[PDB]
Design an enzyme around this catalytic site. Structure first.
Site, short mmCIF file in Angstrom:
data_model
loop_
_atom_site.label_atom_id
_atom_site.label_comp_id
_atom_site.label_asym_id
_atom_site.label_seq_id
_atom_site.Cartn_x
_atom_site.Cartn_y
_atom_site.Cartn_z
N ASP A 94 -8.24 26.49 -1.79
CA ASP A 94 -9.32 26.01 -0.95
C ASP A 94 -9.40 26.98 0.24
O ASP A 94 -8.49 27.79 0.42
CB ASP A 94 -9.04 24.54 -0.59
N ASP A 255 -7.75 14.42 -3.92
CA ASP A 255 -6.73 15.00 -3.07
C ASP A 255 -6.84 14.38 -1.68
O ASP A 255 -7.94 14.16 -1.17
CB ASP A 255 -6.87 16.53 -2.98
N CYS A 367 11.38 -1.72 -2.50
CA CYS A 367 10.91 -0.42 -2.98
C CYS A 367 12.06 0.36 -3.62
O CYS A 367 13.16 0.41 -3.10
CB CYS A 367 10.27 0.40 -1.87
N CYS A 372 13.26 5.08 0.63
CA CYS A 372 13.64 3.73 1.02
C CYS A 372 15.11 3.47 0.65
O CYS A 372 15.88 2.96 1.47
CB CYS A 372 12.69 2.70 0.40
#
Ligand SMILES: [Zn+2]
EC number: 2.4.2.-
Length: 413
Positions: A94, A255, A367, A372
């Site tokens: 990009d 994205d 999680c 985590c």
């Protein structure tokens, strides 16, 4: 396949030498080279990275951006080695249009950009665009200098999109044409034009600031033009409740860093879940980075000591609570004692309920992700960049898990 997710690089890596208890690190460690991207922490949290030329060239982002050393290392060793990308992942180039949005024309020549994408060895390269910020409100009609400007930037993008397709004819990347617009019809115009030139691959640009309804109406307008083979990419977007809708409407690629941005930029709902219900992170600031507390010290409102101790007691309580060695009741009291101080008393009572929920539900125990399970309660503390960005990383993995769930569904009857 049906919908890929790419992670945009904005120097979002973590320092694995951070001591969460002591809040020191290895001061002799080199930024980037010794740090972890999400794909170094998780097995597979995205399908690839998107790299902006303007960001790599440092001039753009306005920030703690690419250094000259980082930039030389990038080209010296190649961008696979730079990012430590695994071979099952892919890369898209990009230009970083957001960096030069307020300039007259884009500052790069098309030849430079193709140079960059060829030497970076990207899988996909995105044509050199100039953004059209602004989109017509309901029953609003742009005229005069506003419309002339919109049309001017549409013409500059399509001029350059066509130069780019031609000048990139013997390159190893697949080229993607950028579509800008100020309404559904201008977007359709841009897409017709790009397909006409021979693009199979489209980037819907300038959609980040829009509401979802505005995005979905634009796509329902573009869907007729699309073909079996046409790839469509939404630059900057990742709105997971809308995934099923984007797939319906022919989007193959998204994205976004916004799950990561959301970890520290939002007031509520910093810690995402796959249920989609979210939790507020608990504010415990560094006493000597907080503006609010700098001033309280400076003004004579508290002795510096007592600040430092209330900070400690809150951090200590949190840690005790997570070793199941302190009541939720008393944990709250420590944390709120400190909130009383860096935000005032009435504000403390406002946020009490939100905190009861976060601490009570112990959602970080639920999680399964590696952040985590490695740092525990620290993921739900809003403090410095080390905790904030790890929470970001959790949000990245959560989004990608939502995406895989949606991709797992097949219609039958
Ligand atoms: Zn997690």
């Amino acid at each position: 396949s049906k919908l890929k997710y790419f992670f945009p690089d904005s120097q979002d890596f973590i320092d694995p030498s951070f001591d969460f208890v002591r809040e020191t690190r290895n001061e002799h460690r080199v930024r980037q080279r010794d740090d972890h991207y999400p794909h170094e922490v998780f097995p597979h949290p995205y399908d690839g990275m998107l790299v902006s030329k303007a960001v790599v060239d440092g001039l753009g982002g306005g920030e703690s951006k690419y250094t000259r050393a980082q930039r030389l290392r990038y080209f010296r060793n190649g961008m696979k080695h730079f990012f430590r990308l695994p071979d099952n992942m892919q890369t898209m180039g990009d230009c970083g249009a957001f960096t030069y949005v307020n300039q007259d024309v884009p500052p790069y020549r098309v030849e430079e950009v193709i140079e960059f994408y060829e030497t970076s060895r990207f899988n996909y390269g995105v044509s050199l665009d100039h953004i059209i910020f602004g989109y017509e409100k309901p029953g609003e009609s742009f005229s005069g200098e506003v419309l002339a400007e919109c049309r001017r930037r549409q013409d500059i993008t399509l001029t350059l999109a066509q130069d780019f397709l031609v000048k990139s004819q013997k390159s190893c990347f697949t080229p993607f044409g950028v579509a800008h617009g100020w309404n559904k019809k201008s977007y359709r115009q841009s897409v017709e034009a790009l397909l006409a030139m021979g693009y199979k691959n489209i980037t819907m640009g300038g959609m980040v600031p829009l509401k979802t309804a505005q995005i979905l109406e634009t796509l329902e307008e573009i869907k007729p033009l699309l073909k079996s083979d046409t790839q469509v990419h939404l630059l900057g977007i990742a709105r997971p409740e809308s995934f099923a809708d984007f797939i319906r409407l022919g989007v193959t690629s998204i994205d976004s860093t916004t799950p990561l941005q959301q970890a520290f930029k939002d007031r509520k709902n910093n810690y995402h879940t796959p249920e989609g219900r979210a939790y507020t992170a608990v504010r415990v600031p560094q006493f000597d980075a907080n503006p609010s507390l700098s001033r309280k010290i400076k003004s004579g409102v508290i002795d510096q000591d007592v600040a430092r101790h209330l900070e400690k007691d809150a951090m200590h309580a949190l840690f005790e609570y997570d070793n199941n060695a302190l009541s939720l009741e008393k944990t709250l009291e420590a944390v709120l004692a400190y909130e009383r101080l860096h935000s005032g008393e009435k504000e403390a009572e406002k946020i009490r309920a939100d905190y009861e929920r976060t601490l009570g539900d112990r959602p970080w125990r639920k999680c399964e992700c590696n952040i985590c399970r490695s740092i525990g309660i620290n993921v739900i503390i809003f403090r410095g960049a080390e905790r904030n960005r790890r929470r970001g990383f959790h949000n990245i993995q959560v989004l990608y898990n939502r995406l895989q769930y949606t991709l797992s569904l097949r219609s039958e009857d």
